[PDB]
Protein backbone atom coordinates (compact mmCIF):
# COMPACT_ATOMS: atom_id res chain seq x y z
CA UNK A 1 0.00 0.00 0.00
CA UNK A 2 0.95 3.75 -0.21
CA UNK A 3 -0.16 6.93 1.69
CA UNK A 4 -3.78 8.13 1.12
CA UNK A 5 -5.23 11.52 2.23
CA UNK A 6 -8.65 13.23 2.79
CA UNK A 7 -8.64 17.09 2.41
CA UNK A 8 -11.48 19.68 2.56
CA UNK A 9 -10.85 23.24 1.30
CA UNK A 10 -12.90 26.40 1.82
CA UNK A 11 -12.27 29.64 -0.15
CA UNK A 12 -14.08 32.89 0.74
CA UNK A 13 -13.75 36.12 -1.37
CA UNK A 14 -15.14 39.54 -0.25
CA UNK A 15 -16.73 41.82 -2.95
CA UNK A 16 -16.40 39.20 -5.73
CA UNK A 17 -16.92 40.22 -9.43
CA UNK A 18 -20.16 39.26 -11.35
CA UNK A 19 -20.49 35.41 -11.34
CA UNK A 20 -17.44 34.36 -9.16
CA UNK A 21 -18.83 32.75 -5.94
CA UNK A 22 -18.08 34.50 -2.59
CA UNK A 23 -17.63 30.97 -1.15
CA UNK A 24 -16.39 27.65 -2.60
CA UNK A 25 -15.70 24.27 -0.92
CA UNK A 26 -14.15 21.11 -2.43
CA UNK A 27 -13.10 17.73 -0.98
CA UNK A 28 -10.25 15.59 -2.37
CA UNK A 29 -9.10 12.01 -1.69
CA UNK A 30 -5.42 12.02 -2.85
CA UNK A 31 -5.40 14.19 -6.04
CA UNK A 32 -9.09 13.32 -6.98
CA UNK A 33 -11.91 15.80 -6.21
CA UNK A 34 -14.82 13.99 -4.41
CA UNK A 35 -17.21 16.86 -3.42
CA UNK A 36 -18.06 20.50 -4.32
CA UNK A 37 -20.31 23.26 -2.96
CA UNK A 38 -20.53 27.00 -3.75
CA UNK A 39 -22.51 30.15 -2.81
CA UNK A 40 -24.28 30.04 -6.23
CA UNK A 41 -25.47 26.41 -6.34
CA UNK A 42 -25.88 26.34 -2.53
CA UNK A 43 -25.70 22.55 -2.82
CA UNK A 44 -23.13 19.84 -1.88
CA UNK A 45 -22.65 17.67 -5.02
CA UNK A 46 -20.40 14.66 -5.75
CA UNK A 47 -17.37 15.29 -8.10
CA UNK A 48 -16.74 11.50 -8.65
CA UNK A 49 -19.34 8.84 -9.67
CA UNK A 50 -18.13 6.33 -6.97
CA UNK A 51 -19.09 9.01 -4.37
CA UNK A 52 -22.47 9.61 -6.17
CA UNK A 53 -23.21 5.82 -6.28
CA UNK A 54 -22.41 4.91 -2.63
CA UNK A 55 -23.73 7.97 -0.65
CA UNK A 56 -27.57 8.20 -0.35
CA UNK A 57 -29.47 11.48 -1.00
CA UNK A 58 -29.77 11.90 2.84
CA UNK A 59 -25.96 12.51 3.02
CA UNK A 60 -25.94 15.32 0.32
CA UNK A 61 -29.08 16.92 1.97
CA UNK A 62 -27.45 16.98 5.48
CA UNK A 63 -24.01 18.23 4.33
CA UNK A 64 -25.74 20.79 2.07
CA UNK A 65 -27.16 22.40 5.27
CA UNK A 66 -23.83 22.17 7.18
CA UNK A 67 -22.07 23.95 4.24
CA UNK A 68 -24.81 26.66 4.19
CA UNK A 69 -23.88 27.21 7.88
CA UNK A 70 -20.10 27.14 7.20
CA UNK A 71 -20.59 29.63 4.26
CA UNK A 72 -22.28 32.16 6.63
CA UNK A 73 -19.52 31.66 9.29
CA UNK A 74 -16.81 32.10 6.59
CA UNK A 75 -18.45 35.40 5.45
CA UNK A 76 -18.48 36.72 9.09
CA UNK A 77 -14.88 35.48 9.85
CA UNK A 78 -13.48 37.25 6.67
CA UNK A 79 -15.42 40.51 7.36
CA UNK A 80 -13.97 40.52 10.96
CA UNK A 81 -10.35 39.94 9.71
CA UNK A 82 -10.72 42.85 7.17
CA UNK A 83 -11.88 45.06 10.14
CA UNK A 84 -8.82 44.01 12.28
CA UNK A 85 -6.31 44.74 9.42
CA UNK A 86 -8.30 47.87 8.26
CA UNK A 87 -8.55 46.32 4.74
CA UNK A 88 -11.14 47.54 2.17
CA UNK A 89 -11.71 46.05 -1.35
CA UNK A 90 -11.59 42.26 -2.03
CA UNK A 91 -9.49 39.88 0.18
CA UNK A 92 -9.43 36.02 0.38
CA UNK A 93 -9.83 33.58 3.34
CA UNK A 94 -8.93 29.88 3.03
CA UNK A 95 -9.24 26.78 5.27
CA UNK A 96 -7.69 23.32 4.72
CA UNK A 97 -8.49 20.35 7.01
CA UNK A 98 -7.48 16.72 6.52
CA UNK A 99 -5.77 13.48 7.55
CA UNK A 100 -3.29 10.99 6.00
CA UNK A 101 -3.61 7.19 6.44
CA UNK A 102 -0.04 5.73 5.89
CA UNK A 103 0.71 2.05 4.96
CA UNK A 104 2.28 1.29 8.43
CA UNK A 105 -1.28 2.02 9.80
CA UNK A 106 -0.27 5.38 11.46
CA UNK A 107 -2.02 8.77 10.82
CA UNK A 108 -1.58 12.58 10.58
CA UNK A 109 -4.14 15.41 10.81
CA UNK A 110 -3.90 19.16 10.10
CA UNK A 111 -6.05 22.31 10.04
CA UNK A 112 -4.86 25.73 8.81
CA UNK A 113 -6.15 29.09 7.57
CA UNK A 114 -4.71 31.60 5.07
CA UNK A 115 -5.48 35.33 4.60
CA UNK A 116 -4.70 36.54 1.00
CA UNK A 117 -3.07 33.13 0.25
CA UNK A 118 -0.53 33.39 3.18
CA UNK A 119 -0.42 31.17 6.36
CA UNK A 120 -2.54 32.88 9.08
CA UNK A 121 -3.38 30.17 11.72
CA UNK A 122 -2.00 26.58 12.01
CA UNK A 123 -3.43 24.03 14.48
CA UNK A 124 -1.41 21.56 16.60
CA UNK A 125 -3.74 18.71 17.71
CA UNK A 126 -1.06 17.35 20.15
CA UNK A 127 -0.37 20.60 22.13
CA UNK A 128 -4.05 21.70 21.47
CA UNK A 129 -2.72 25.16 20.43
CA UNK A 130 -2.81 27.57 17.45
CA UNK A 131 0.34 29.10 15.83
CA UNK A 132 -0.38 32.76 14.81
CA UNK A 133 1.83 34.69 12.23
CA UNK A 134 0.93 38.32 13.36
CA UNK A 135 -0.86 40.32 16.20
CA UNK A 136 -4.32 39.92 14.45
CA UNK A 137 -3.97 36.08 14.25
CA UNK A 138 -2.72 36.04 17.91
CA UNK A 139 -6.04 37.82 18.76
CA UNK A 140 -8.11 35.04 17.04
CA UNK A 141 -5.86 32.29 18.55
CA UNK A 142 -6.77 33.56 22.14
CA UNK A 143 -10.60 33.29 21.75
CA UNK A 144 -10.11 29.75 20.20
CA UNK A 145 -7.64 28.52 22.92
CA UNK A 146 -10.09 29.56 25.75
CA UNK A 147 -12.67 27.05 24.35
CA UNK A 148 -11.07 23.78 25.63
CA UNK A 149 -14.15 21.75 24.35
CA UNK A 150 -13.78 23.06 20.74
CA UNK A 151 -10.01 22.19 20.63
CA UNK A 152 -10.83 18.64 21.90
CA UNK A 153 -13.68 18.29 19.31
CA UNK A 154 -11.10 19.25 16.53
CA UNK A 155 -8.47 16.76 17.80
CA UNK A 156 -11.14 13.99 17.85
CA UNK A 157 -12.43 14.85 14.34
CA UNK A 158 -8.88 14.93 12.88
CA UNK A 159 -7.74 11.66 14.56
CA UNK A 160 -10.93 9.48 14.33
CA UNK A 161 -13.75 10.90 12.13
CA UNK A 162 -11.55 12.21 9.23
CA UNK A 163 -9.74 8.80 9.15
CA UNK A 164 -13.05 6.83 9.24
CA UNK A 165 -14.38 9.01 6.36
CA UNK A 166 -11.11 8.42 4.38
CA UNK A 167 -11.24 4.58 4.86
CA UNK A 168 -14.93 4.64 3.73
CA UNK A 169 -14.20 6.70 0.55
CA UNK A 170 -11.02 4.58 -0.18
CA UNK A 171 -13.40 1.53 -0.35
CA UNK A 172 -16.03 3.38 -2.48
CA UNK A 173 -13.33 4.39 -5.06
CA UNK A 174 -10.89 1.41 -4.66
CA UNK A 175 -10.86 0.74 -8.47
CA UNK A 176 -9.75 4.40 -9.11
CA UNK A 177 -7.77 5.20 -5.90
CA UNK A 178 -5.91 1.87 -5.22
CA UNK A 179 -5.17 0.88 -8.89
CA UNK A 180 -1.68 1.06 -10.51
CA UNK A 181 -1.06 2.15 -14.14
CA UNK A 182 2.71 1.52 -14.61
CA UNK A 183 4.77 4.28 -16.32
CA UNK A 184 5.99 3.95 -19.98
CA UNK A 185 9.61 5.29 -19.59
CA UNK A 186 12.02 6.19 -22.52
CA UNK A 187 15.42 8.07 -22.84
CA UNK A 188 15.96 10.73 -25.60
CA UNK A 189 19.37 12.03 -26.77
CA UNK A 190 19.25 15.79 -27.66
CA UNK A 191 22.19 18.00 -28.92
CA UNK A 192 21.01 21.00 -26.76
CA UNK A 193 23.70 23.15 -28.49
CA UNK A 194 26.45 22.26 -31.06
CA UNK A 195 29.04 19.91 -29.34
CA UNK A 196 26.94 19.47 -26.08
CA UNK A 197 24.65 16.39 -25.55
CA UNK A 198 21.87 16.34 -22.84
CA UNK A 199 19.91 13.12 -21.88
CA UNK A 200 16.10 13.21 -21.21
CA UNK A 201 14.45 10.46 -19.05
CA UNK A 202 10.67 10.77 -19.73
CA UNK A 203 7.74 8.87 -18.09
CA UNK A 204 4.00 9.02 -18.89
CA UNK A 205 0.69 7.09 -18.56
CA UNK A 206 1.30 6.50 -14.78
CA UNK A 207 -0.93 6.59 -11.67
CA UNK A 208 -0.62 7.35 -8.84
CA UNK A 209 1.21 10.65 -9.66
CA UNK A 210 4.03 10.10 -7.03
CA UNK A 211 7.22 8.94 -8.90
CA UNK A 212 11.01 9.07 -8.10
CA UNK A 213 13.23 9.85 -11.18
CA UNK A 214 17.02 10.46 -11.00
CA UNK A 215 20.15 10.14 -13.18
CA UNK A 216 23.00 8.08 -11.69
CA UNK A 217 26.50 7.35 -13.04
CA UNK A 218 28.58 4.15 -12.85
CA UNK A 219 26.51 7.57 -7.64
CA UNK A 220 23.73 10.24 -7.95
CA UNK A 221 24.45 13.08 -10.51
CA UNK A 222 24.55 16.88 -9.73
CA UNK A 223 22.95 19.51 -12.07
CA UNK A 224 19.77 17.36 -12.62
CA UNK A 225 16.92 19.49 -14.13
CA UNK A 226 13.35 18.20 -13.31
CA UNK A 227 10.01 18.53 -15.15
CA UNK A 228 6.96 18.80 -12.82
CA UNK A 229 4.55 15.80 -12.38
CA UNK A 230 1.76 16.96 -14.79
CA UNK A 231 -1.76 15.58 -15.46
CA UNK A 232 -2.22 14.00 -18.95
CA UNK A 233 -6.05 14.65 -18.84
CA UNK A 234 -7.04 10.91 -18.95
CA UNK A 235 -6.44 10.47 -15.16
CA UNK A 236 -2.72 9.53 -15.72
CA UNK A 237 0.47 11.68 -15.31
CA UNK A 238 3.80 12.39 -17.11
CA UNK A 239 7.22 13.71 -15.91
CA UNK A 240 10.94 13.81 -16.87
CA UNK A 241 14.53 14.33 -15.54
CA UNK A 242 17.45 15.69 -17.71
CA UNK A 243 21.30 15.85 -17.29
CA UNK A 244 24.04 17.30 -19.59
CA UNK A 245 27.06 15.14 -20.60
CA UNK A 246 30.34 16.87 -19.61
CA UNK A 247 32.29 16.24 -22.88
CA UNK A 248 35.15 13.61 -22.92
CA UNK A 249 33.60 12.01 -19.74
CA UNK A 250 32.49 8.80 -21.59
CA UNK A 251 31.17 7.70 -18.15
CA UNK A 252 28.33 5.16 -17.77
CA UNK A 253 25.10 7.13 -17.12
CA UNK A 254 21.71 5.54 -16.27
CA UNK A 255 18.12 6.73 -15.47
CA UNK A 256 16.52 5.25 -12.25
CA UNK A 257 12.69 5.35 -11.75
CA UNK A 258 10.57 4.18 -8.78
CA UNK A 259 6.73 4.11 -8.99
CA UNK A 260 4.22 2.23 -6.77
CA UNK A 261 6.69 -0.41 -5.42
CA UNK A 262 8.60 -1.16 -8.74
CA UNK A 263 12.21 0.02 -9.52
CA UNK A 264 13.39 0.48 -13.22
CA UNK A 265 16.91 1.16 -14.67
CA UNK A 266 17.33 2.50 -18.28
CA UNK A 267 21.09 2.68 -19.23
CA UNK A 268 22.43 4.49 -22.39
Amino acid at each position, epitope marked *: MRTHSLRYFRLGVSDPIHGVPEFISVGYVDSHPITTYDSVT*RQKEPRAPWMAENLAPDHWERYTQ*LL*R*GWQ*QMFKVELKRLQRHYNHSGSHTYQRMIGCELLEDGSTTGFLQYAYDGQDFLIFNKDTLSWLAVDNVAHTIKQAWEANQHELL*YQKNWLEE*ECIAWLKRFLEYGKDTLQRTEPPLVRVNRKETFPGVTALFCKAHGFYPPEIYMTWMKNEIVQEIDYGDILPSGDGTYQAWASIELDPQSSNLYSCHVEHSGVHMVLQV
Partner: antibody
Amino acid sequence: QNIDQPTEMTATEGAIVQINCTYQTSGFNGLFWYQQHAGEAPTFLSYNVLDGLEEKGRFSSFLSRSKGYSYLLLKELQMKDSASYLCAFLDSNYQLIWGAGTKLIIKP
Amino acid sequence: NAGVTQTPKFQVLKTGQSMTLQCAQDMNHNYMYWYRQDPGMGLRLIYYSASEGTTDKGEVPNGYNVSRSTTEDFPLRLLSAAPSQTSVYFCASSNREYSPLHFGNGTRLTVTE
Protein backbone atom coordinates in the same frame (compact mmCIF):
# COMPACT_ATOMS: atom_id res chain seq x y z
CA GLN B 1 -28.65 3.81 16.48
CA ASN B 2 -29.48 3.95 20.22
CA ILE B 3 -28.79 5.74 23.54
CA ASP B 4 -29.90 4.30 26.95
CA GLN B 5 -30.08 5.91 30.43
CA PRO B 6 -32.14 4.85 33.50
CA THR B 7 -35.67 6.37 33.77
CA GLU B 8 -35.35 7.28 37.51
CA MET B 9 -32.71 7.26 40.27
CA THR B 10 -33.21 8.06 44.01
CA ALA B 11 -30.39 9.01 46.39
CA THR B 12 -29.97 10.77 49.77
CA GLU B 13 -28.82 14.38 50.36
CA GLY B 14 -25.05 14.63 50.99
CA ALA B 15 -24.40 11.31 49.24
CA ILE B 16 -23.12 10.32 45.72
CA VAL B 17 -25.03 9.29 42.52
CA GLN B 18 -23.54 7.96 39.23
CA ILE B 19 -25.97 8.38 36.26
CA ASN B 20 -24.86 6.00 33.44
CA CYS B 21 -25.48 6.51 29.67
CA THR B 22 -24.64 3.86 26.99
CA TYR B 23 -24.67 4.64 23.22
CA GLN B 24 -24.18 2.59 19.98
CA THR B 25 -23.04 4.53 16.83
CA SER B 26 -20.52 4.36 13.95
CA GLY B 27 -19.22 7.94 14.14
CA PHE B 28 -19.12 10.25 17.16
CA ASN B 29 -18.52 14.03 17.63
CA GLY B 30 -18.97 13.92 21.45
CA LEU B 31 -21.35 13.34 24.42
CA PHE B 32 -23.24 16.06 26.34
CA TRP B 33 -25.20 16.07 29.63
CA TYR B 34 -28.00 18.62 30.17
CA GLN B 35 -29.80 19.36 33.49
CA GLN B 36 -33.59 20.00 33.24
CA HIS B 37 -35.52 21.10 36.39
CA ALA B 38 -39.29 20.41 36.44
CA GLY B 39 -41.07 23.07 34.30
CA GLU B 40 -37.68 24.58 33.13
CA ALA B 41 -35.38 24.53 30.01
CA PRO B 42 -32.52 21.99 29.70
CA THR B 43 -29.15 23.75 30.49
CA PHE B 44 -25.71 22.50 29.39
CA LEU B 45 -23.74 20.62 32.11
CA SER B 46 -20.85 18.70 30.42
CA TYR B 47 -19.06 17.81 27.10
CA ASN B 48 -16.74 14.77 26.70
CA VAL B 49 -15.26 13.64 23.28
CA LEU B 50 -11.79 12.20 24.24
CA ASP B 51 -11.61 9.29 26.78
CA GLY B 52 -11.54 10.23 30.48
CA LEU B 53 -12.90 12.46 33.24
CA GLU B 54 -13.79 16.22 33.45
CA GLU B 55 -14.44 17.81 36.95
CA LYS B 56 -16.29 21.10 37.71
CA GLY B 57 -17.35 21.64 41.40
CA ARG B 58 -19.52 18.71 42.68
CA PHE B 59 -20.10 17.35 39.08
CA SER B 60 -17.85 14.95 37.05
CA SER B 61 -18.39 13.56 33.49
CA PHE B 62 -16.62 10.38 32.25
CA LEU B 63 -16.41 8.86 28.71
CA SER B 64 -15.22 5.37 27.59
CA ARG B 65 -15.25 5.36 23.70
CA SER B 66 -14.31 1.60 23.83
CA LYS B 67 -17.40 0.62 25.87
CA GLY B 68 -19.77 3.32 24.41
CA TYR B 69 -20.34 4.52 27.96
CA SER B 70 -20.54 7.87 29.87
CA TYR B 71 -21.44 8.75 33.52
CA LEU B 72 -22.42 12.01 35.21
CA LEU B 73 -21.15 11.76 38.88
CA LEU B 74 -22.77 14.19 41.41
CA LYS B 75 -21.07 14.45 44.87
CA GLU B 76 -22.47 16.04 48.14
CA LEU B 77 -26.04 15.90 46.84
CA GLN B 78 -28.37 18.86 47.52
CA MET B 79 -32.23 18.99 47.21
CA LYS B 80 -31.73 21.44 44.23
CA ASP B 81 -29.92 18.58 42.33
CA SER B 82 -33.48 17.11 42.01
CA ALA B 83 -33.99 17.30 38.18
CA SER B 84 -33.99 15.28 34.91
CA TYR B 85 -30.43 14.65 33.52
CA LEU B 86 -30.42 14.43 29.67
CA CYS B 87 -27.77 12.26 27.94
CA ALA B 88 -27.04 13.20 24.24
CA PHE B 89 -24.37 12.45 21.51
CA LEU B 90 -23.43 13.90 18.06
CA ASP B 91 -23.14 11.24 15.26
CA SER B 92 -20.89 11.60 12.13
CA ASN B 93 -23.46 13.97 10.49
CA TYR B 94 -23.69 16.22 13.66
CA GLN B 95 -27.23 14.84 14.32
CA LEU B 96 -27.97 15.33 18.12
CA ILE B 97 -29.37 11.97 19.48
CA TRP B 98 -31.13 12.42 22.91
CA GLY B 99 -31.60 9.86 25.71
CA ALA B 100 -35.11 9.68 27.29
CA GLY B 101 -33.52 11.36 30.40
CA THR B 102 -32.91 10.22 34.05
CA LYS B 103 -35.27 11.71 36.71
CA LEU B 104 -33.00 12.19 39.84
CA ILE B 105 -34.96 12.23 43.18
CA ILE B 106 -32.96 13.38 46.27
CA LYS B 107 -34.40 12.14 49.62
CA PRO B 108 -33.91 14.67 52.47
CA ASN C 1 -27.77 38.82 26.51
CA ALA C 2 -31.30 37.38 27.22
CA GLY C 3 -30.31 34.08 25.50
CA VAL C 4 -33.39 32.47 23.87
CA THR C 5 -36.89 34.12 24.22
CA GLN C 6 -39.74 31.68 23.29
CA THR C 7 -43.50 32.69 23.49
CA PRO C 8 -46.06 31.84 24.53
CA LYS C 9 -45.31 29.74 27.67
CA PHE C 10 -48.80 28.11 27.48
CA GLN C 11 -51.51 27.58 24.82
CA VAL C 12 -54.74 25.62 24.40
CA LEU C 13 -56.07 25.05 20.83
CA LYS C 14 -59.24 23.47 19.36
CA THR C 15 -58.66 20.63 16.77
CA GLY C 16 -57.91 22.36 13.42
CA GLN C 17 -56.76 25.77 14.71
CA SER C 18 -53.55 27.38 13.41
CA MET C 19 -50.75 28.61 15.75
CA THR C 20 -47.32 30.35 15.62
CA LEU C 21 -44.71 29.85 18.40
CA GLN C 22 -42.20 32.74 18.42
CA CYS C 23 -38.49 32.16 19.11
CA ALA C 24 -35.60 34.70 19.13
CA GLN C 25 -31.96 34.85 20.32
CA ASP C 26 -29.63 37.92 20.54
CA MET C 27 -26.48 35.68 20.56
CA ASN C 28 -25.65 35.66 16.76
CA HIS C 29 -26.10 31.84 16.78
CA ASN C 30 -26.08 30.16 13.32
CA TYR C 31 -28.13 27.13 14.47
CA MET C 32 -31.72 27.22 15.80
CA TYR C 33 -33.84 24.13 16.61
CA TRP C 34 -37.49 23.24 17.40
CA TYR C 35 -37.99 20.12 19.63
CA ARG C 36 -41.04 18.46 21.21
CA GLN C 37 -40.64 16.72 24.64
CA ASP C 38 -43.17 13.93 25.44
CA PRO C 39 -43.22 11.59 28.49
CA GLY C 40 -40.88 8.53 28.21
CA MET C 41 -38.78 9.50 25.11
CA GLY C 42 -35.89 11.87 24.24
CA LEU C 43 -36.32 15.36 22.73
CA ARG C 44 -37.54 14.89 19.08
CA LEU C 45 -36.27 17.44 16.49
CA ILE C 46 -39.18 19.02 14.53
CA TYR C 47 -37.12 21.37 12.24
CA TYR C 48 -33.67 23.08 12.37
CA SER C 49 -31.82 25.91 10.53
CA ALA C 50 -28.01 26.14 10.03
CA SER C 51 -28.19 29.94 9.19
CA GLU C 52 -30.52 32.73 8.04
CA GLY C 53 -31.85 31.66 4.58
CA THR C 54 -32.00 27.85 5.16
CA THR C 55 -34.16 25.35 7.14
CA ASP C 56 -34.59 21.55 7.02
CA LYS C 57 -36.84 18.76 8.46
CA GLY C 58 -35.89 17.06 11.75
CA GLU C 59 -37.22 13.62 12.83
CA VAL C 60 -40.97 14.58 13.14
CA PRO C 61 -41.57 17.53 10.76
CA ASN C 62 -45.14 16.43 9.76
CA GLY C 63 -47.89 19.00 10.67
CA TYR C 64 -45.37 21.86 11.29
CA ASN C 65 -43.49 24.48 9.23
CA VAL C 66 -40.68 26.98 10.13
CA SER C 67 -39.00 30.00 8.47
CA ARG C 68 -35.54 31.68 9.05
CA SER C 69 -35.68 35.15 7.31
CA THR C 70 -33.22 36.48 10.01
CA THR C 71 -30.34 35.22 12.24
CA GLU C 72 -32.53 36.18 15.31
CA ASP C 73 -36.01 34.59 14.68
CA PHE C 74 -37.07 30.91 14.10
CA PRO C 75 -40.92 30.85 14.25
CA LEU C 76 -42.68 27.40 14.39
CA ARG C 77 -46.12 27.21 12.71
CA LEU C 78 -48.74 24.56 13.67
CA LEU C 79 -50.66 24.10 10.39
CA SER C 80 -53.75 22.25 11.77
CA ALA C 81 -53.76 21.47 15.55
CA ALA C 82 -54.29 17.72 16.24
CA PRO C 83 -54.41 16.08 19.74
CA SER C 84 -51.14 14.17 18.89
CA GLN C 85 -49.51 17.66 18.99
CA THR C 86 -50.32 18.06 22.76
CA SER C 87 -46.69 18.27 24.03
CA VAL C 88 -44.02 20.64 25.45
CA TYR C 89 -42.12 22.53 22.68
CA PHE C 90 -38.57 23.91 23.20
CA CYS C 91 -36.78 26.34 20.87
CA ALA C 92 -32.93 26.07 21.04
CA SER C 93 -29.89 27.83 19.54
CA SER C 94 -26.17 26.90 19.22
CA ASN C 95 -23.19 28.88 17.81
CA ARG C 96 -22.12 25.85 15.66
CA GLU C 97 -23.35 22.35 14.62
CA TYR C 98 -21.21 20.81 17.46
CA SER C 99 -21.55 23.52 20.20
CA PRO C 100 -23.83 23.50 23.28
CA LEU C 101 -27.60 24.25 22.88
CA HIS C 102 -29.19 27.26 24.72
CA PHE C 103 -32.95 26.50 25.19
CA GLY C 104 -36.00 28.76 25.51
CA ASN C 105 -38.39 28.37 28.49
CA GLY C 106 -40.72 26.11 26.49
CA THR C 107 -44.37 26.19 25.34
CA ARG C 108 -46.86 23.82 27.05
CA LEU C 109 -49.50 23.09 24.38
CA THR C 110 -52.79 21.19 24.70
CA VAL C 111 -55.11 20.48 21.72
CA THR C 112 -58.71 19.49 22.63
CA GLU C 113 -61.57 18.59 20.24
